[PDB]
Design a protein around this nucleic acid. Sequence first.
RNA 1: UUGACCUCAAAUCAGGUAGGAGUACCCGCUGAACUUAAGCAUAUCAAUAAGCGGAGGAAAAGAAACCAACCGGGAUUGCCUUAGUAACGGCGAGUGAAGCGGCAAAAGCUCAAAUUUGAAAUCUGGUACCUUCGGUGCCCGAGUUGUAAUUUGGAGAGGG
RNA 2: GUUCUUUGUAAAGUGCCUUCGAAGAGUCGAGUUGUUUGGGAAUGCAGCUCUAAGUGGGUGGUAAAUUCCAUCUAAAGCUAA
RNA 3: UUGACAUUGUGAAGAGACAUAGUUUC
RNA 4: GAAGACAUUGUCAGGUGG
Lengths: 187, 96, 84, 102, 182
Amino acid sequence: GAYKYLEELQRKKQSDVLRFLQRVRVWEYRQKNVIHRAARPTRPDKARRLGYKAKQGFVIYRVRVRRGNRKRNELKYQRSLRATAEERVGRRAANLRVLNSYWVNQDSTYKYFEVILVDPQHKAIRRDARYNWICDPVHKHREARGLTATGKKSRGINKGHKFNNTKAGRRKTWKRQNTLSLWRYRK
Amino acid sequence: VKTGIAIGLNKGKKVTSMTPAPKISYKKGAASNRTKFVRSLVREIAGLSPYERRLIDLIRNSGEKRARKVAKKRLGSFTRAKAKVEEMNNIIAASR
Amino acid sequence: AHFWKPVLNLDKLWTLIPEDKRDQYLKSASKETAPVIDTLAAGYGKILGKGRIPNVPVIVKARFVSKLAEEKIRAAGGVVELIA
Amino acid sequence: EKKERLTKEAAAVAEGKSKQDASPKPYAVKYGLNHVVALIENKKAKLVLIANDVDPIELVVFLPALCKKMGVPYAIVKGKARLGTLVNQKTSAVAALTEVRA
Amino acid sequence: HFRKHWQERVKVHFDQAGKKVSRRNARATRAAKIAPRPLDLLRPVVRAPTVKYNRKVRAGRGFTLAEVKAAGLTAAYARTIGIAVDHRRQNRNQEIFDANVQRLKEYQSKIIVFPRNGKAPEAEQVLSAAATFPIAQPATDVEARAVQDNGESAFRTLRLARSEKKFRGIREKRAREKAEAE
RNA sequence: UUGACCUCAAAUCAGGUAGGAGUACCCGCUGAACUUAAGCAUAUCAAUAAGCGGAGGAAAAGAAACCAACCGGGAUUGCCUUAGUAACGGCGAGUGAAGCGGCAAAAGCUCAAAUUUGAAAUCUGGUACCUUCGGUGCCCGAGUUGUAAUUUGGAGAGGG
RNA sequence: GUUCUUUGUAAAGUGCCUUCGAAGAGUCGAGUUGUUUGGGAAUGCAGCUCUAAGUGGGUGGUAAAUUCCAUCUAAAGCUAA
RNA sequence: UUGACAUUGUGAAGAGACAUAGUUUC
RNA sequence: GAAGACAUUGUCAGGUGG
């Protein structure tokens, strides 16, 4: 297959050809709308290893954000831009459920992303039970509760002693440990 | 194996080992006979980044320790700068 | 974790024998059948010497021992085994 | 053609009791990209065709180099729908040929 | 430690008692749902970490793949039969290997397994299996043994072991710097 | 000239969907101050109240890129304990954990990454019929810039 | 408990020999800025910059060069109590 | 208010360092 | 048409500074 011949190539993000294509596509995406749709990705392997399957109901929106911090300037916006993008399209395309995202391109002023979306009222997705979990109602707007990759990263959620403050919900364990617990028969 | 006491260069209790099966999730980089060819192919296609040009150009004229330092400055570490600059030396050798 | 070294004086040192073989080993100088004692299984990591004890040779198993302790046990004719 | 082949071979295996090889062998182009690139590096191709017009060009740039390496006679055709016309798909972006009638 | 406004966040386990009854009812419900089975998976014996506790053993998570294979069956049938599995655990001790294998052998001897087809004989279940295959801390020695002596006095051993370990690098340095002479 | 394809569009197009309230609990974002520090200013009150988004009947987390440093343990969550210990801080007020151990509950697994290649075997939809929380058939179509079967590192696949 | 269908030359497991065993990138990691933590010579997070490797890579709470050892397989994902 | 990173492209000469010839300092 | 690798935008470091 071509999976690795693309993967090992797109890691080479500073070769002449890829910086040429980057100079092309960034201008294209600047002139298009901020949020928009391309009916086929620019990075198909990298889609296909997030949960994409090219069938009826899987959707790709492409998206744009400013670069820089939260100006109120030196406040640093704990939402990742990846997550920010996901919020934006999950608002616009409401019915759709976000599945994951990724990076295609960048610029000094902007960062251009792509997003994977699913239409779980579509019947292929209701069937085809590798993907009949998203139609369960808990996954409404995954992005804004942070259950995508970057959301979990910036919640701080991986295993460790480094992630001991934030492992099981930061506010949950705060409420666990900044809490007095009294029994009936004291101790 | 240990000594048989609590403290020593191999301390602790001594018992019969079993040497269990070497698990598949340690052999991650033992790469392939495919992906070597792949990685080489993409290298020759996509070429060489500018700092990789400057690196080998430094190795031509002004030695390789400065190149090691420069890799350690572009990237963070030393244990990756060593491998990258040695790989670049290997490529310069293979050019002839 | 590293710092579990709860002491046992040579004084106590027969309560480990629950009540009953206490007598049977007390009325015995047996170098052939001597009682074994497990400081670690009773939850003690190091021996210290405070006490004075009969001369009955009795075996003891532990990790850490002091000089008067091993001297007194060898005086009774018991012995220490430096298990880990 | 497939369904005619099936309604033939069902009777052929019910009465004639073949191994589902009573029907003859096919000789046809092989048109999936991953199929193609898998066949290459087994050198099970004698001609492959390549479409110039693909904006996700990363899909295709490695092919002439790889075909050169494996010594297979590549070719860059102009037009991808032109290649779809012979598979009965809108676009194929490649086609190959490995086995031919004499 | 009450300079904060703790008074809104207080947990008061009045419901210890009620939780207990709900819990026992859940046990009984799951068991009557699971009617012939013992309500618990067979769990192995394992010897703990953290030298403070190394004397003990502990009813761990799951037996291993290799020990199951030494019993001569597969994980796939084990988890139906009522046996657990861990896979990320690895056996590097033979007494434990043998003991877990012995537990499995006892279990396979001690159960009867219905067909998938049925005819469903009378089974008269047990509530738990931890009771019948109790975790058992092993013997280290019988109470009685003869004395032997070695004249080492059992303190100097520890002391010079300490000395050798703390001066190992320097003795190696001496050996290497005399070795690399001329 | 005619015509495949791509991309971008309009339709009171066929069929579908989201918003809003509630908001005790829950995931996130933004985020103060009084008070306190004999006063004062980093600090504490607080990663809190307020504000804003988003869900369910539980949510979140989750089968390790873990804890360890022991004869090694073994997903997660909660409880007792570690412990008011370690660590921190005008070592000031004060703040303040975690592993191990006992108990409750105990469930594992899936994708990409193999060429089915002697046969896209997959699928929405329309239509007709039927035993209708859906099946069979015919048809337009999606799809090779990859739908199904297989395989997920615990392993495993091809061959005999 | 019953009752009618029969799958099925399908599918699965099982040992022995051989060959391979593909394993996620603007991501890991490093610098610097701000915030945060009990985390202190620099834990986590976000932004900006530089940006990789595959007998590799992370982690091992005191710095920092080197060499070992141990455990693990990241950057994709679901799920009861 | 000044300097640094990237955005940030293609050019021809001069001075050059390198394998007639491409790699980069002005 | 003007302008053009400078501008500028995103991020950093000096002097001044109710």
